[PDB]
Design a protein around this ligand. Structure first.
Ligand code: FGN
Ligand code: K
Ligand code: K
Ligand code: ZN
Length: 397
């Protein structure tokens, strides 16, 4: 089956943040508006039987002082009084400030994503689902003891930790516009979780990594060569983005032979995102996103699909609704007939001006990256005693 994380309390918590507003409700109500929910198995967010078990779950990656500070931040932001100077100091020491402010539900909001993505991974492990989608998860910038980029708790790291502990290998694929630095760093020393991020990188552009450092770093210790990165230039369209990462994806799968794939599918690469770095689409005749997901799904490896960035809420909905239909098609083998106009539903009015499912958009260095990345993959194969034909992979490029 294809699983999808939602629930009534889950939806309220995913829509309680000041930055992402009601995005999750547009997304699930468009998936519902297109009659896709009956095709999907609902996966309920994981809950715990005590504070200690929750704490144990989250501090599998995050420090206990950080988790404590995040909960105290929520408590402070639920009272009238302003933070003391000592409380502002303590929040500063975890970067619980600026781009990661406090708000009345900040802890419950952050934990909800972890609940969602841990349950998603358990559904994969117990083989209840072949694919699970969590459009409320994917917060890849959060670090062990530091929020970043509106990511307070790294649900991806925790879901991946659960998967590899269930020899188990996980391939993480980060399609967000921005470098997936939190997940890469969590597994920097681990060869069993191979991380791969395609992203924009340029001087000054958040978060600064996943590019020349001048060498490309790629893991350390036993995780040497296990962190993959493909920084691309602004303006890239669907076909060039697809061709840039198509052969890398296929060769990673050939060589790593992963037990699970986790795909972060941040929607801020859309041409219509207020970022406007890349020019990808949701078009389905082809959308770089849809091309990448179809390819990963053709592998028939149990796969977690997650959300992430995406600041044009209706176009994120348009995209993720198409990705969700595509998953149903490739997994179940059932054709999905999506109408070209948005169906009438609660959020219909948000889909101005023409109320179509297509977004309103009219559409040397990568070969060096391919040679670099393919050499890293051989170094990874050699370091980890993996068996593969170096000519069947080089054929892909
Ligand atoms: O997407 C992110 C992270 C996004 C992000 C991080 C740091 C600074 C700005 C950022 O986003 C720009 C933005 C915001 Cl903060 C609000 C509205 C519109 C735009 Cl463009 N994770 O990978
Ligand atoms: K990325
Ligand atoms: K790694
Ligand atoms: Zn992003």
């Amino acid at each position: 089956s294809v699983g999808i994380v939602y629930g009534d309390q889950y939806r309220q918590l995913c829509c309680s943040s000041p930055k992402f507003g009601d995005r999750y409700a547009l997304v699930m109500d468009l998936i519902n508006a297109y009659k896709l929910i009956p095709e999907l198995s609902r996966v309920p967010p994981l809950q715990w039987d005590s504070p200690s078990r929750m704490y144990e779950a989250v501090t599998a990656f995050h420090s206990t002082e950080y988790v404590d500070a995040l909960k105290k931040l929520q408590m402070l932001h639920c009272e009238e009084k302003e933070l003391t100077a000592d409380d502002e100091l303590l929040m500063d020491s975890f970067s619980l400030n600026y781009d990661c402010p406090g708000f009345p539900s900040v802890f419950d909001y952050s934990l909800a994503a972890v609940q969602g993505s841990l349950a998603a991974a358990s559904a994969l492990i117990c083989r209840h689902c072949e694919v699970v989608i969590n459009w409320g998860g994917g917060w890849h910038h959060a670090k062990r003891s530091e929020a970043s980029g509106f990511c307070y708790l790294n649900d991806i790291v925790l879901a991946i930790h659960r998967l590899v502990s269930s020899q188990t290998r996980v391939l993480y694929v980060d399609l967000d516009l921005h470098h997936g630095d939190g997940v890469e760093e969590a597994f920097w020393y681990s060869p069993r979780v191979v991380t791969f991020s395609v992203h924009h990188a340029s001087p000054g552009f958040f978060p600064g990594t996943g590019t020349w450092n001048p060498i490309f770093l790629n893991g350390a210790g036993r995780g040497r060569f296990s962190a993959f990165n493909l920084p691309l230039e602004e303006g890239i369209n669907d076909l060039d983005w697809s061709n840039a990462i198509g052969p890398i994806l296929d060769s990673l799968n050939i060589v790593i032979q992963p037990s699970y794939v986790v795909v972060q599918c941040g929607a801020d690469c859309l041409a219509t995102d207020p970022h406007r770095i890349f020019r990808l689409t949701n078009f389905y005749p082809l959308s770089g996103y849809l091309y990448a997901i179809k390819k990963i799904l053709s592998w028939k490896v149990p796969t977690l699909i997650l959300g992430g960035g995406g600041y044009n809420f209706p176009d994120t909905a348009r995209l993720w609704t198409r990705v969700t239909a595509l998953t149903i098609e490739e997994v179940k083998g059932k054709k999905m007939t999506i109408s070209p106009e948005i169906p009438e539903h609660s959020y219909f009015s948000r889909y101005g001006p023409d109320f179509e499912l297509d977004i309103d958009y009219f559409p040397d260095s990568i070969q060096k990256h391919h040679r670099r990345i393919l050499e890293q993959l051989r170094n990874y194969a050699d370091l980890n005693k993996l068996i593969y034909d170096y000519d069947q992979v080089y054929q892909l490029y």
